[PDB]
Amino acid sequence: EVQLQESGLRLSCASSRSIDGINIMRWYRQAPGKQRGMVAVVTGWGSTNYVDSVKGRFIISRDSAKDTVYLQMNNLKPEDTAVYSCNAIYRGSEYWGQGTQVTVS
Amino acid sequence: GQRYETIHGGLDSIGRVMEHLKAIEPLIAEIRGPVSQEFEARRAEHAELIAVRANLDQAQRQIAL
Amino acid sequence: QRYETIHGGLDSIGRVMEHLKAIEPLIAEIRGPVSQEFEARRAEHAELIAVRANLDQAQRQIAL
Amino acid sequence: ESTQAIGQRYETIHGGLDSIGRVMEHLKAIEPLIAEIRGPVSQEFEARRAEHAELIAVRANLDQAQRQIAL
Amino acid sequence: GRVMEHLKAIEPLIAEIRGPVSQEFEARRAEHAELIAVRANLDQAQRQIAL
């Protein structure tokens, strides 16, 4: 039982509880008229990677204190325009929030 | 001819109602979907609680000891 | 939300009947002109049979 | 049963949902049949008025032949 | 006309698949809801164990 409420060139979410008691979490990008797509990955380690499209572009960071994760938009070309939704994985479960959208340019 | 055209407007009406189908039905599909995805999160809960009953039983037995 | 799932099933069913009761009558009226205005076209065909027959007779009377 | 049964049940749920989706997709392509059953269809329903006149022209041919017989 | 009568015949599948979702899911949501409290039982178990 976890809730991931969204926020947000810099966007974040907050979990119900147990940040860093929460193992792997990642973010996903929903381009319109398209299906789901992963964006970037933080782990409990702080080990991090991106997807090739946004490689170099986006930067992701975890704040252990206030139960949250961060994505910051960078040098965006409108092509990334999409609706984004932040994801997490907990003892073998999905965890999806409501997500939020990003615009042209 | 005139009567031909009257019932041809009828066929146009049937085409517009099928256009209503084209506009409505898939939205119904992806409103059924997320209900099911929440139910999958419910599978996850069920597995968690499978793990939980055995823990409760071993805890109570060791409490007795 | 799952109550809305139930009602979504019900309303998709309802609009489906809206169709069914539209098509089958609408196809019925569309059936209409087919039959009765082939009768009309047959009337036309017989008339332009009679006309060509009388033209044949008229041209024979021209010649004679 | 609590998960594996709910497992098979959820595969049945998604099978049904997407199967209805497939059936709706098959339905999706019925309007083009309506367009085919109307467009040039109504075109000839105008063509009836278009080509109902040269037979009136042969009506005139018979009339002119008739009073020429009289003449 | 064939395909329209086909949809007429297709609706009953939609109804009967609309059913069990409702029934089984409400009922065994109630089931999971009661099995939620097993976790509270477990928390009481560990607190008593520590004491």
mmCIF file of C-alpha atoms in Angstrom:
data_model
loop_
_atom_site.group_PDB
_atom_site.id
_atom_site.type_symbol
_atom_site.label_atom_id
_atom_site.label_comp_id
_atom_site.label_asym_id
_atom_site.label_seq_id
_atom_site.Cartn_x
_atom_site.Cartn_y
_atom_site.Cartn_z
ATOM 1 C CA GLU A 1 0.000 0.000 0.000
ATOM 2 C CA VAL A 2 1.971 2.955 -1.372
ATOM 3 C CA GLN A 3 0.875 6.185 -3.033
ATOM 4 C CA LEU A 4 3.078 8.167 -5.423
ATOM 5 C CA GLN A 5 1.704 11.696 -5.781
ATOM 6 C CA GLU A 6 3.347 13.756 -8.518
ATOM 7 C CA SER A 7 4.486 17.358 -8.660
ATOM 8 C CA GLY A 8 6.075 19.701 -11.165
ATOM 9 C CA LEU A 9 12.106 22.153 -16.015
ATOM 10 C CA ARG A 10 12.181 20.090 -12.848
ATOM 11 C CA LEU A 11 9.670 17.541 -11.629
ATOM 12 C CA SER A 12 9.205 15.279 -8.635
ATOM 13 C CA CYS A 13 6.982 12.866 -6.744
ATOM 14 C CA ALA A 14 6.477 11.799 -3.148
ATOM 15 C CA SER A 15 5.879 8.289 -1.883
ATOM 16 C CA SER A 16 3.523 7.191 0.844
ATOM 17 C CA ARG A 17 6.411 6.195 3.106
ATOM 18 C CA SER A 18 9.723 4.369 3.399
ATOM 19 C CA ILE A 19 11.900 6.208 0.921
ATOM 20 C CA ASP A 20 15.095 4.143 0.591
ATOM 21 C CA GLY A 21 13.055 1.476 2.191
ATOM 22 C CA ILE A 22 11.638 1.643 -1.300
ATOM 23 C CA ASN A 23 13.878 -0.208 -3.712
ATOM 24 C CA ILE A 24 14.006 0.380 -7.482
ATOM 25 C CA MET A 25 11.931 3.258 -8.814
ATOM 26 C CA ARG A 26 11.896 4.846 -12.253
ATOM 27 C CA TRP A 27 9.967 7.299 -14.394
ATOM 28 C CA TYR A 28 8.003 6.794 -17.590
ATOM 29 C CA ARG A 29 7.102 8.981 -20.559
ATOM 30 C CA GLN A 30 3.789 8.785 -22.410
ATOM 31 C CA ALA A 31 4.069 10.446 -25.791
ATOM 32 C CA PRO A 32 0.529 10.984 -27.105
ATOM 33 C CA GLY A 33 -0.852 8.419 -29.496
ATOM 34 C CA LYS A 34 1.896 6.087 -28.286
ATOM 35 C CA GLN A 35 2.247 3.405 -25.640
ATOM 36 C CA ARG A 36 4.210 3.383 -22.381
ATOM 37 C CA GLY A 37 7.906 4.194 -22.181
ATOM 38 C CA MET A 38 10.566 4.221 -19.455
ATOM 39 C CA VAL A 39 12.643 7.341 -18.869
ATOM 40 C CA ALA A 40 15.293 7.166 -16.169
ATOM 41 C CA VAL A 41 16.190 4.994 -13.214
ATOM 42 C CA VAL A 42 17.304 5.712 -9.670
ATOM 43 C CA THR A 43 17.928 2.812 -7.335
ATOM 44 C CA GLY A 44 18.253 2.513 -3.590
ATOM 45 C CA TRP A 45 21.990 2.820 -4.174
ATOM 46 C CA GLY A 46 21.755 6.053 -6.022
ATOM 47 C CA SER A 47 22.974 4.040 -8.983
ATOM 48 C CA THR A 48 21.450 5.716 -11.987
ATOM 49 C CA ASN A 49 20.980 5.465 -15.720
ATOM 50 C CA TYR A 50 18.868 6.969 -18.466
ATOM 51 C CA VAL A 51 17.349 5.792 -21.724
ATOM 52 C CA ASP A 52 19.229 6.514 -24.930
ATOM 53 C CA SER A 53 16.825 9.168 -26.186
ATOM 54 C CA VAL A 54 17.138 11.285 -23.048
ATOM 55 C CA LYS A 55 20.733 10.300 -22.297
ATOM 56 C CA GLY A 56 22.714 13.373 -21.402
ATOM 57 C CA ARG A 57 19.460 15.289 -21.463
ATOM 58 C CA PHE A 58 17.805 14.485 -18.165
ATOM 59 C CA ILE A 59 19.181 14.285 -14.653
ATOM 60 C CA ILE A 60 17.647 12.444 -11.728
ATOM 61 C CA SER A 61 18.325 12.709 -8.033
ATOM 62 C CA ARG A 62 17.004 11.228 -4.808
ATOM 63 C CA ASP A 63 16.424 13.100 -1.554
ATOM 64 C CA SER A 64 16.535 10.576 1.269
ATOM 65 C CA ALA A 65 14.939 12.973 3.738
ATOM 66 C CA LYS A 66 11.584 14.076 2.363
ATOM 67 C CA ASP A 67 10.319 10.843 0.784
ATOM 68 C CA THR A 68 10.851 11.894 -2.801
ATOM 69 C CA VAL A 69 12.649 11.541 -6.123
ATOM 70 C CA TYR A 70 13.564 14.166 -8.691
ATOM 71 C CA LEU A 71 13.624 14.625 -12.467
ATOM 72 C CA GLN A 72 14.877 17.881 -13.966
ATOM 73 C CA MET A 73 14.130 18.738 -17.596
ATOM 74 C CA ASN A 74 17.181 19.798 -19.588
ATOM 75 C CA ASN A 75 17.840 21.569 -22.911
ATOM 76 C CA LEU A 76 14.589 20.130 -24.134
ATOM 77 C CA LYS A 77 13.679 19.909 -27.782
ATOM 78 C CA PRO A 78 9.890 19.894 -28.201
ATOM 79 C CA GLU A 79 10.007 16.299 -29.432
ATOM 80 C CA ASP A 80 10.046 15.100 -25.825
ATOM 81 C CA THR A 81 6.650 16.772 -25.326
ATOM 82 C CA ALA A 82 4.597 14.142 -23.545
ATOM 83 C CA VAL A 83 2.712 13.211 -20.396
ATOM 84 C CA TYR A 84 4.956 11.718 -17.754
ATOM 85 C CA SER A 85 4.122 9.419 -14.879
ATOM 86 C CA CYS A 86 6.423 8.436 -12.037
ATOM 87 C CA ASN A 87 6.742 4.758 -11.171
ATOM 88 C CA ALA A 88 8.063 2.619 -8.328
ATOM 89 C CA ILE A 89 8.506 -1.064 -7.485
ATOM 90 C CA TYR A 90 7.846 -2.496 -4.010
ATOM 91 C CA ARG A 91 8.294 -6.160 -3.050
ATOM 92 C CA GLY A 92 7.324 -7.241 -6.552
ATOM 93 C CA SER A 93 4.472 -4.816 -7.213
ATOM 94 C CA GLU A 94 3.756 -2.051 -9.653
ATOM 95 C CA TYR A 95 3.181 1.380 -8.232
ATOM 96 C CA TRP A 96 1.835 4.073 -10.517
ATOM 97 C CA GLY A 97 0.573 7.539 -9.697
ATOM 98 C CA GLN A 98 -1.511 9.956 -11.740
ATOM 99 C CA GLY A 99 1.356 11.434 -13.717
ATOM 100 C CA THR A 100 1.623 14.826 -15.349
ATOM 101 C CA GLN A 101 2.219 16.261 -18.803
ATOM 102 C CA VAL A 102 4.915 18.328 -20.477
ATOM 103 C CA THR A 103 4.410 20.655 -23.410
ATOM 104 C CA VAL A 104 6.013 21.850 -26.653
ATOM 105 C CA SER A 105 9.389 23.640 -26.582
ATOM 106 C CA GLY B 1 -34.257 10.316 -57.332
ATOM 107 C CA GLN B 2 -36.174 11.752 -54.405
ATOM 108 C CA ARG B 3 -37.179 8.648 -52.435
ATOM 109 C CA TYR B 4 -33.776 7.122 -53.097
ATOM 110 C CA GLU B 5 -32.233 10.230 -51.551
ATOM 111 C CA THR B 6 -34.580 10.157 -48.554
ATOM 112 C CA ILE B 7 -33.542 6.696 -47.537
ATOM 113 C CA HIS B 8 -29.962 7.482 -48.561
ATOM 114 C CA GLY B 9 -30.023 10.191 -45.925
ATOM 115 C CA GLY B 10 -31.220 7.351 -43.731
ATOM 116 C CA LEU B 11 -28.040 5.457 -44.645
ATOM 117 C CA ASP B 12 -26.083 8.621 -43.846
ATOM 118 C CA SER B 13 -27.770 8.570 -40.440
ATOM 119 C CA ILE B 14 -26.676 4.995 -39.898
ATOM 120 C CA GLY B 15 -23.148 5.994 -40.904
ATOM 121 C CA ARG B 16 -23.117 8.812 -38.362
ATOM 122 C CA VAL B 17 -24.265 6.468 -35.589
ATOM 123 C CA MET B 18 -21.436 4.105 -36.483
ATOM 124 C CA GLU B 19 -19.155 7.146 -36.315
ATOM 125 C CA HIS B 20 -20.498 7.435 -32.772
ATOM 126 C CA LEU B 21 -19.284 3.863 -32.259
ATOM 127 C CA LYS B 22 -15.856 4.813 -33.597
ATOM 128 C CA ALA B 23 -15.751 7.746 -31.160
ATOM 129 C CA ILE B 24 -16.990 5.881 -28.066
ATOM 130 C CA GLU B 25 -15.923 2.234 -27.953
ATOM 131 C CA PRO B 26 -12.103 2.381 -27.519
ATOM 132 C CA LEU B 27 -12.500 4.894 -24.695
ATOM 133 C CA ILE B 28 -14.585 2.169 -23.073
ATOM 134 C CA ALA B 29 -11.698 -0.232 -23.631
ATOM 135 C CA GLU B 30 -9.112 1.888 -21.844
ATOM 136 C CA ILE B 31 -11.509 2.724 -19.055
ATOM 137 C CA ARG B 32 -11.934 -0.996 -18.391
ATOM 138 C CA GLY B 33 -8.148 -1.368 -18.430
ATOM 139 C CA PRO B 34 -6.991 0.626 -15.377
ATOM 140 C CA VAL B 35 -9.583 -1.062 -13.188
ATOM 141 C CA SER B 36 -7.791 -4.283 -14.033
ATOM 142 C CA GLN B 37 -4.360 -2.757 -13.411
ATOM 143 C CA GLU B 38 -5.463 -1.791 -9.916
ATOM 144 C CA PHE B 39 -6.639 -5.375 -9.530
ATOM 145 C CA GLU B 40 -3.126 -6.493 -10.407
ATOM 146 C CA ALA B 41 -1.797 -4.300 -7.612
ATOM 147 C CA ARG B 42 -4.320 -6.309 -5.633
ATOM 148 C CA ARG B 43 -2.559 -9.524 -6.709
ATOM 149 C CA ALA B 44 0.588 -8.029 -5.240
ATOM 150 C CA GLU B 45 -1.270 -7.459 -1.992
ATOM 151 C CA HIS B 46 -2.464 -11.076 -2.013
ATOM 152 C CA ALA B 47 1.109 -12.357 -2.337
ATOM 153 C CA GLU B 48 2.236 -10.083 0.497
ATOM 154 C CA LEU B 49 -0.438 -11.502 2.767
ATOM 155 C CA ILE B 50 0.449 -15.068 1.804
ATOM 156 C CA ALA B 51 3.871 -14.233 3.187
ATOM 157 C CA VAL B 52 2.201 -12.635 6.211
ATOM 158 C CA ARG B 53 0.081 -15.529 7.560
ATOM 159 C CA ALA B 54 3.063 -17.852 8.015
ATOM 160 C CA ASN B 55 5.007 -15.126 9.801
ATOM 161 C CA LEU B 56 2.073 -14.609 12.141
ATOM 162 C CA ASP B 57 1.903 -18.336 12.899
ATOM 163 C CA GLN B 58 5.607 -18.715 13.664
ATOM 164 C CA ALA B 59 5.517 -15.578 15.801
ATOM 165 C CA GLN B 60 2.600 -16.866 17.872
ATOM 166 C CA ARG B 61 4.196 -20.280 18.355
ATOM 167 C CA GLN B 62 7.456 -18.763 19.543
ATOM 168 C CA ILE B 63 5.388 -16.529 21.819
ATOM 169 C CA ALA B 64 3.958 -19.674 23.385
ATOM 170 C CA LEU B 65 7.420 -21.179 23.873
ATOM 171 C CA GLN C 1 -14.687 3.195 -10.310
ATOM 172 C CA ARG C 2 -15.776 -0.435 -10.565
ATOM 173 C CA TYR C 3 -19.400 0.667 -10.321
ATOM 174 C CA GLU C 4 -18.555 2.838 -13.328
ATOM 175 C CA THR C 5 -17.042 -0.286 -14.906
ATOM 176 C CA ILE C 6 -20.406 -2.025 -14.518
ATOM 177 C CA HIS C 7 -22.265 0.996 -15.877
ATOM 178 C CA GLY C 8 -19.806 1.198 -18.763
ATOM 179 C CA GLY C 9 -20.688 -2.339 -19.721
ATOM 180 C CA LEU C 10 -24.367 -1.414 -19.502
ATOM 181 C CA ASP C 11 -24.070 1.780 -21.572
ATOM 182 C CA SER C 12 -21.962 0.182 -24.304
ATOM 183 C CA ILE C 13 -24.712 -2.423 -24.505
ATOM 184 C CA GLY C 14 -27.337 0.329 -24.681
ATOM 185 C CA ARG C 15 -25.727 2.235 -27.544
ATOM 186 C CA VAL C 16 -25.261 -1.089 -29.311
ATOM 187 C CA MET C 17 -29.039 -1.579 -29.198
ATOM 188 C CA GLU C 18 -29.426 2.017 -30.394
ATOM 189 C CA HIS C 19 -27.580 0.914 -33.500
ATOM 190 C CA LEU C 20 -29.360 -2.399 -33.929
ATOM 191 C CA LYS C 21 -32.780 -0.708 -33.828
ATOM 192 C CA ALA C 22 -31.444 1.931 -36.211
ATOM 193 C CA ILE C 23 -29.790 -0.292 -38.830
ATOM 194 C CA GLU C 24 -32.434 -2.950 -39.251
ATOM 195 C CA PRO C 25 -35.256 -0.443 -39.851
ATOM 196 C CA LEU C 26 -32.944 1.776 -41.938
ATOM 197 C CA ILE C 27 -31.891 -1.202 -44.037
ATOM 198 C CA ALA C 28 -35.596 -1.971 -44.378
ATOM 199 C CA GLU C 29 -36.461 1.394 -45.879
ATOM 200 C CA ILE C 30 -33.366 1.139 -48.086
ATOM 201 C CA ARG C 31 -34.796 -2.180 -49.258
ATOM 202 C CA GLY C 32 -37.951 -0.299 -50.264
ATOM 203 C CA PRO C 33 -36.839 1.768 -53.275
ATOM 204 C CA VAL C 34 -35.006 -1.223 -54.672
ATOM 205 C CA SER C 35 -38.182 -3.207 -55.289
ATOM 206 C CA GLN C 36 -40.649 -0.473 -56.141
ATOM 207 C CA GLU C 37 -38.401 1.510 -58.415
ATOM 208 C CA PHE C 38 -37.259 -1.548 -60.306
ATOM 209 C CA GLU C 39 -40.950 -1.781 -60.997
ATOM 210 C CA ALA C 40 -40.655 1.820 -62.194
ATOM 211 C CA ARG C 41 -37.625 1.029 -64.350
ATOM 212 C CA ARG C 42 -39.513 -1.905 -65.860
ATOM 213 C CA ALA C 43 -42.332 0.493 -66.710
ATOM 214 C CA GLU C 44 -39.748 2.671 -68.426
ATOM 215 C CA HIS C 45 -38.275 -0.329 -70.239
ATOM 216 C CA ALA C 46 -41.671 -1.425 -71.560
ATOM 217 C CA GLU C 47 -42.427 2.121 -72.664
ATOM 218 C CA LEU C 48 -39.188 2.390 -74.617
ATOM 219 C CA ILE C 49 -40.016 -0.960 -76.102
ATOM 220 C CA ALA C 50 -43.381 0.320 -77.331
ATOM 221 C CA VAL C 51 -41.819 3.543 -78.581
ATOM 222 C CA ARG C 52 -39.186 1.731 -80.646
ATOM 223 C CA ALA C 53 -41.817 -0.641 -82.031
ATOM 224 C CA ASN C 54 -43.982 2.255 -83.180
ATOM 225 C CA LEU C 55 -40.899 3.945 -84.618
ATOM 226 C CA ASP C 56 -40.220 0.824 -86.653
ATOM 227 C CA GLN C 57 -43.779 0.859 -87.959
ATOM 228 C CA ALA C 58 -43.608 4.604 -88.591
ATOM 229 C CA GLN C 59 -40.402 4.324 -90.601
ATOM 230 C CA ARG C 60 -41.858 1.474 -92.640
ATOM 231 C CA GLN C 61 -44.791 3.750 -93.408
ATOM 232 C CA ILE C 62 -42.307 6.497 -94.305
ATOM 233 C CA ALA C 63 -40.795 4.175 -96.885
ATOM 234 C CA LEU C 64 -44.041 2.812 -98.307
ATOM 235 C CA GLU D 1 -5.398 -20.070 -4.509
ATOM 236 C CA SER D 2 -5.156 -16.498 -3.247
ATOM 237 C CA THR D 3 -2.747 -15.376 -5.992
ATOM 238 C CA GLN D 4 -2.346 -18.153 -8.551
ATOM 239 C CA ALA D 5 -6.113 -18.494 -8.889
ATOM 240 C CA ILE D 6 -6.365 -14.708 -9.040
ATOM 241 C CA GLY D 7 -3.572 -15.053 -11.558
ATOM 242 C CA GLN D 8 -5.542 -17.197 -13.983
ATOM 243 C CA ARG D 9 -8.616 -15.095 -13.275
ATOM 244 C CA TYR D 10 -6.785 -11.931 -14.261
ATOM 245 C CA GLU D 11 -5.496 -13.470 -17.445
ATOM 246 C CA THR D 12 -9.141 -14.281 -18.178
ATOM 247 C CA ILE D 13 -10.114 -10.696 -17.372
ATOM 248 C CA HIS D 14 -7.588 -9.211 -19.788
ATOM 249 C CA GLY D 15 -8.289 -11.832 -22.416
ATOM 250 C CA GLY D 16 -11.929 -10.837 -22.299
ATOM 251 C CA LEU D 17 -11.291 -7.106 -22.285
ATOM 252 C CA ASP D 18 -8.892 -7.177 -25.209
ATOM 253 C CA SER D 19 -11.086 -9.685 -27.043
ATOM 254 C CA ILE D 20 -13.954 -7.237 -26.854
ATOM 255 C CA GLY D 21 -11.438 -4.689 -28.103
ATOM 256 C CA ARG D 22 -10.670 -6.896 -31.096
ATOM 257 C CA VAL D 23 -14.358 -7.369 -31.863
ATOM 258 C CA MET D 24 -14.881 -3.630 -31.691
ATOM 259 C CA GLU D 25 -11.972 -3.197 -34.088
ATOM 260 C CA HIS D 26 -13.648 -5.561 -36.533
ATOM 261 C CA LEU D 27 -16.769 -3.440 -36.136
ATOM 262 C CA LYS D 28 -14.710 -0.310 -36.793
ATOM 263 C CA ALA D 29 -14.551 -0.987 -40.542
ATOM 264 C CA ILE D 30 -18.258 -1.115 -41.321
ATOM 265 C CA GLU D 31 -18.919 2.543 -42.228
ATOM 266 C CA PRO D 32 -16.724 2.356 -45.377
ATOM 267 C CA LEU D 33 -19.214 -0.234 -46.585
ATOM 268 C CA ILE D 34 -21.921 2.376 -46.037
ATOM 269 C CA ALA D 35 -19.989 4.905 -48.103
ATOM 270 C CA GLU D 36 -19.624 2.311 -50.867
ATOM 271 C CA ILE D 37 -23.356 1.573 -50.681
ATOM 272 C CA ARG D 38 -24.182 5.266 -51.199
ATOM 273 C CA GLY D 39 -21.774 7.428 -53.193
ATOM 274 C CA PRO D 40 -21.910 6.486 -56.877
ATOM 275 C CA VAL D 41 -25.149 4.805 -55.824
ATOM 276 C CA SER D 42 -26.811 8.202 -55.421
ATOM 277 C CA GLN D 43 -24.784 9.289 -58.455
ATOM 278 C CA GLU D 44 -26.880 7.032 -60.671
ATOM 279 C CA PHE D 45 -29.984 8.016 -58.761
ATOM 280 C CA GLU D 46 -29.323 11.402 -60.297
ATOM 281 C CA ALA D 47 -28.391 9.699 -63.573
ATOM 282 C CA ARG D 48 -31.972 8.416 -63.794
ATOM 283 C CA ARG D 49 -33.129 12.006 -64.235
ATOM 284 C CA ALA D 50 -30.109 12.567 -66.459
ATOM 285 C CA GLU D 51 -31.039 9.781 -68.924
ATOM 286 C CA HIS D 52 -34.825 9.802 -68.612
ATOM 287 C CA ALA D 53 -34.882 12.596 -71.238
ATOM 288 C CA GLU D 54 -33.437 11.118 -74.449
ATOM 289 C CA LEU D 55 -36.344 8.689 -74.333
ATOM 290 C CA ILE D 56 -38.569 11.761 -74.196
ATOM 291 C CA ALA D 57 -36.503 12.742 -77.241
ATOM 292 C CA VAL D 58 -37.643 9.551 -78.967
ATOM 293 C CA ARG D 59 -41.147 10.470 -77.848
ATOM 294 C CA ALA D 60 -40.597 13.641 -79.868
ATOM 295 C CA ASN D 61 -39.182 11.505 -82.692
ATOM 296 C CA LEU D 62 -42.402 9.491 -82.811
ATOM 297 C CA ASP D 63 -44.508 12.642 -82.606
ATOM 298 C CA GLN D 64 -42.619 14.284 -85.478
ATOM 299 C CA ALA D 65 -42.813 11.117 -87.544
ATOM 300 C CA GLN D 66 -46.539 10.969 -86.828
ATOM 301 C CA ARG D 67 -47.415 14.408 -88.091
ATOM 302 C CA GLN D 68 -44.981 13.889 -90.974
ATOM 303 C CA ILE D 69 -47.071 10.860 -91.897
ATOM 304 C CA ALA D 70 -50.022 13.215 -91.778
ATOM 305 C CA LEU D 71 -48.213 15.687 -94.057
ATOM 306 C CA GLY E 1 -26.829 -6.568 -42.564
ATOM 307 C CA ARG E 2 -24.742 -9.629 -41.778
ATOM 308 C CA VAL E 3 -22.331 -7.688 -39.615
ATOM 309 C CA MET E 4 -25.085 -5.751 -37.865
ATOM 310 C CA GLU E 5 -26.860 -8.916 -36.791
ATOM 311 C CA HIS E 6 -23.369 -10.107 -35.817
ATOM 312 C CA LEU E 7 -23.106 -7.268 -33.286
ATOM 313 C CA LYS E 8 -26.623 -8.076 -32.067
ATOM 314 C CA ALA E 9 -25.348 -11.562 -31.272
ATOM 315 C CA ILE E 10 -22.061 -10.255 -29.827
ATOM 316 C CA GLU E 11 -23.606 -8.208 -26.988
ATOM 317 C CA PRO E 12 -24.372 -11.209 -24.679
ATOM 318 C CA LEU E 13 -20.653 -11.949 -24.339
ATOM 319 C CA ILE E 14 -20.175 -8.355 -23.186
ATOM 320 C CA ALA E 15 -22.893 -8.718 -20.557
ATOM 321 C CA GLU E 16 -21.725 -12.063 -19.180
ATOM 322 C CA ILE E 17 -18.113 -10.886 -19.000
ATOM 323 C CA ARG E 18 -19.288 -7.684 -17.329
ATOM 324 C CA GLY E 19 -20.757 -9.843 -14.563
ATOM 325 C CA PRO E 20 -17.966 -11.853 -12.926
ATOM 326 C CA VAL E 21 -15.650 -8.863 -12.727
ATOM 327 C CA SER E 22 -18.230 -7.253 -10.490
ATOM 328 C CA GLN E 23 -19.072 -10.260 -8.350
ATOM 329 C CA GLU E 24 -15.713 -11.920 -7.752
ATOM 330 C CA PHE E 25 -13.887 -8.646 -7.365
ATOM 331 C CA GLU E 26 -16.189 -7.045 -4.806
ATOM 332 C CA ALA E 27 -16.304 -10.264 -2.785
ATOM 333 C CA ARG E 28 -12.611 -10.956 -2.620
ATOM 334 C CA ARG E 29 -11.808 -7.338 -2.082
ATOM 335 C CA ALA E 30 -13.811 -7.930 1.081
ATOM 336 C CA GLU E 31 -11.602 -11.001 1.582
ATOM 337 C CA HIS E 32 -8.366 -9.027 1.201
ATOM 338 C CA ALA E 33 -9.829 -6.309 3.411
ATOM 339 C CA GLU E 34 -10.277 -8.714 6.301
ATOM 340 C CA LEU E 35 -6.855 -10.217 5.677
ATOM 341 C CA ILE E 36 -5.406 -6.712 5.978
ATOM 342 C CA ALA E 37 -5.851 -6.889 9.764
ATOM 343 C CA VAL E 38 -3.568 -9.919 9.904
ATOM 344 C CA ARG E 39 -0.736 -7.407 9.542
ATOM 345 C CA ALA E 40 -1.980 -5.519 12.605
ATOM 346 C CA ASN E 41 -2.123 -8.842 14.427
ATOM 347 C CA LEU E 42 1.492 -9.353 13.389
ATOM 348 C CA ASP E 43 2.529 -5.940 14.687
ATOM 349 C CA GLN E 44 0.928 -6.780 18.031
ATOM 350 C CA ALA E 45 2.783 -10.088 17.889
ATOM 351 C CA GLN E 46 6.184 -8.424 17.523
ATOM 352 C CA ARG E 47 5.483 -5.803 20.184
ATOM 353 C CA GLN E 48 4.523 -8.550 22.636
ATOM 354 C CA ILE E 49 7.610 -10.523 21.610
ATOM 355 C CA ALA E 50 9.907 -7.577 22.294
ATOM 356 C CA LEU E 51 8.295 -6.969 25.681
#
